[PDB]
């Protein structure tokens, strides 16, 4: 592992903030005209986190097709992700319309509904089996089937029914619940174990639609997920834990959504998780 001694080299030199700035500067920049139309102002959670028009997800609704969401297509790894913001009270129906239209099998949530005294996300899934949710604007019903609460994540089977065709699908909600309010987790082990549960569920398999991933803005903790999954997969395809340049992967993902990886602590954590997750992918 080169990166393991490049990692040790960057900590010594304390220069995480420097590399992270390098990436901010090299990062690509494309139009996001649709996002900043005023008809869409209230469809965005942060005024400065916009999907690029080229990689954006379109709702199949000729009235307004906008939702703040990007398709990240990683060609060498054969892995696609949909990165999105946490739904607004007025976009919850859109969010499930998107999960329906894209044929996604799983949703990964990396935030709690309330963080730092504020609401980072609408409550967009049901809490009790018997209290189903109806989305009138998008003709969808959502039902909680089961719920498996563990120490640092919760998994939920949900049933999504299309009212106007009577088709149903089962969605897996993977909810990481212990991401620190400030900073990043002290060890990646929790995060890695959550990652592998998502993998084992099949939600990433390419017979399915792309997994929907989000946090508050869909770039910070969301990117850490995607970057770690993809780096670890490329280490497999090459079965060589050192042809993978984590900064080069990051810059390629940022062609598809701006700002992935928000802090330089997140970047360090990204390295830390890939290095550690490499143990259990090189035979173990």
């Amino acid at each position: 592992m080169e990166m393991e001694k490049e990692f040790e080299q960057i900590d010594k030199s304390g220069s995480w903030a420097a590399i992270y700035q390098d990436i901010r500067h090299e990062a690509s920049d494309f139009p996001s005209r649709v996002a900043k139309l005023p008809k869409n102002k209230n469809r965005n959670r942060y005024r400065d986190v916009s999907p690029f028009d080229h990689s954006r997800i379109k709702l199949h609704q000729e009235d307004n097709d906008y939702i703040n969401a990007s398709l990240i297509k990683m060609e060498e790894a054969q892995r696609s992700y949909i990165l999105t913001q946490g739904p607004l009270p007025n976009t919850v129906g859109h969010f499930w319309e998107m999960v329906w239209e894209q044929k996604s099998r799983g949703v990964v949530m990396l935030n709690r509904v309330m963080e730092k005294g504020s609401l980072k996300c609408a409550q967009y899934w049901p809490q009790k089996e018997e209290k189903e949710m109806i989305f009138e604007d998008t003709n969808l019903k959502l039902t909680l089937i089961s719920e498996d609460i563990k120490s640092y994540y919760t998994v939920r089977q949900l049933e999504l029914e299309n009212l106007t065709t009577q088709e149903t699908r089962e969605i897996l909600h993977f909810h990481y619940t212990t991401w620190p309010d400030f900073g990043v987790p002290e060890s990646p082990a929790s995060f890695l174990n959550f990652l592998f549960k998502v993998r084992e569920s099949g939600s990433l398999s390419p017979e399915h639609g792309p997994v929907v991933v989000h946090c508050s803005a869909g770039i910070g903790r969301s990117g850490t997920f995607c970057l770690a999954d993809t780096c670890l997969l490329l280490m497999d395809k090459r079965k060589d834990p050192s042809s993978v340049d984590i900064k080069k992967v990051l810059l390629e993902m940022r062609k598809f959504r701006m700002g992935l990886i928000q802090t330089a602590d997140q970047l360090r954590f990204s390295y830390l998780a890939v290095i550690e997750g490499a143990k259990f992918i090189m035979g173990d």
Side-chain angles (χ1 to χ4, degrees):
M1 272 192 263
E2 216 284 313
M3 65 194 312
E4 185 161 11
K5 287 177 262 102
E6 167 171 314
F7 180 86
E8 281 158 43
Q9 195 261 292
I10 292 155
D11 261 323
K12 160 149 194 152
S13 339
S15 45
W16 285 104
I19 319 176
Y20 179 62
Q21 202 56 49
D22 277 356
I23 285 158
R24 289 230 64 79
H25 182 236
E26 293 303 323
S28 59
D29 169 18
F30 302 97
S32 30
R33 290 183 212 113
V34 185
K36 287 193 286 62
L37 298 183
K39 69 182 310 205
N40 297 322
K41 184 231 288 214
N42 65 294
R43 276 176 189 223
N44 298 306
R45 180 183 286 286
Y46 307 101
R47 292 173 195 133
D48 57 1
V49 182
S50 311
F52 299 135
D53 296 312
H54 78 90
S55 59
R56 82 173 171 99
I57 306 288
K58 303 180 195 166
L59 300 165
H60 302 168
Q61 185 178 353
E62 81 269 344
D63 168 39
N64 199 340
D65 76 348
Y66 180 76
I67 177 173
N68 185 323
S70 322
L71 176 68
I72 292 68
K73 214 165 215 44
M74 292 306 279
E75 239 175 40
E76 196 184 347
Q78 321 263 31
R79 203 84 90 160
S80 292
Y81 314 92
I82 295 175
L83 279 202
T84 186
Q85 69 191 8
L88 295 162
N90 59 298
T91 69
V92 166
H94 303 156
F95 168 99
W96 288 109
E97 173 182 15
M98 174 177 75
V99 162
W100 190 269
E101 288 165 357
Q102 300 291 302
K103 291 172 139 51
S104 304
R105 160 87 174 144
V107 183
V108 184
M109 182 175 172
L110 302 172
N111 60 295
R112 302 175 288 301
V113 176
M114 156 159 314
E115 310 182 309
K116 296 195 300 213
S118 306
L119 301 178
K120 300 299 200 213
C121 186
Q123 174 68 54
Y124 66 93
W125 74 96
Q127 261 148 334
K128 294 192 306 206
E129 282 86 341
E130 64 271 24
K131 260 46 154 213
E132 78 267 358
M133 275 173 109
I134 313 288
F135 301 111
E136 323 204 62
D137 55 327
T138 63
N139 267 303
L140 284 168
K141 187 167 68 170
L142 186 63
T143 309
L144 175 75
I145 302 304
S146 149
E147 178 173 294
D148 195 343
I149 306 181
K150 310 277 153 62
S151 42
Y152 64 119
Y153 70 88
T154 294
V155 190
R156 310 194 181 78
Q157 295 175 259
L158 306 165
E159 171 186 296
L160 192 55
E161 194 200 318
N162 186 339
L163 290 187
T164 76
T165 89
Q166 241 172 40
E167 211 191 315
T168 68
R169 323 200 176 136
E170 170 184 310
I171 273 70
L172 297 182
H173 200 255
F174 295 94
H175 186 183
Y176 196 77
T177 53
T178 70
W179 197 288
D181 258 39
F182 302 104
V184 305
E186 288 226 8
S187 98
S190 313
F191 177 81
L192 282 179
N193 195 60
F194 175 74
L195 174 75
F196 282 102
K197 301 292 293 203
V198 182
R199 273 183 178 204
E200 283 166 1
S201 85
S203 294
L204 304 183
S205 159
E207 71 194 302
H208 293 300
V211 68
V212 181
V213 178
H214 77 93
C215 41
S216 47
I219 67 190
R221 305 173 192 171
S222 280
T224 278
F225 186 80
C226 294
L227 184 60
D229 182 55
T230 276
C231 283
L232 283 176
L233 205 66
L234 291 164
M235 276 166 69
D236 256 353
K237 274 212 177 199
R238 305 164 192 165
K239 206 85 196 204
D240 177 10
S242 8
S243 33
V244 178
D245 189 356
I246 164 160
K247 309 175 303 301
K248 218 200 55 193
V249 180
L250 184 45
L251 290 162
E252 187 71 34
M253 291 198 334
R254 283 190 164 221
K255 299 184 179 159
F256 292 100
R257 193 170 170 85
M258 60 163 83
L260 306 182
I261 308 294
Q262 264 313 103
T263 80
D265 276 349
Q266 264 172 16
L267 182 60
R268 182 190 187 277
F269 188 75
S270 288
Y271 278 72
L272 210 56
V274 176
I275 284 151
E276 270 311 311
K279 315 310 189 203
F280 272 34
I281 284 173
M282 271 335 271
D284 218 315

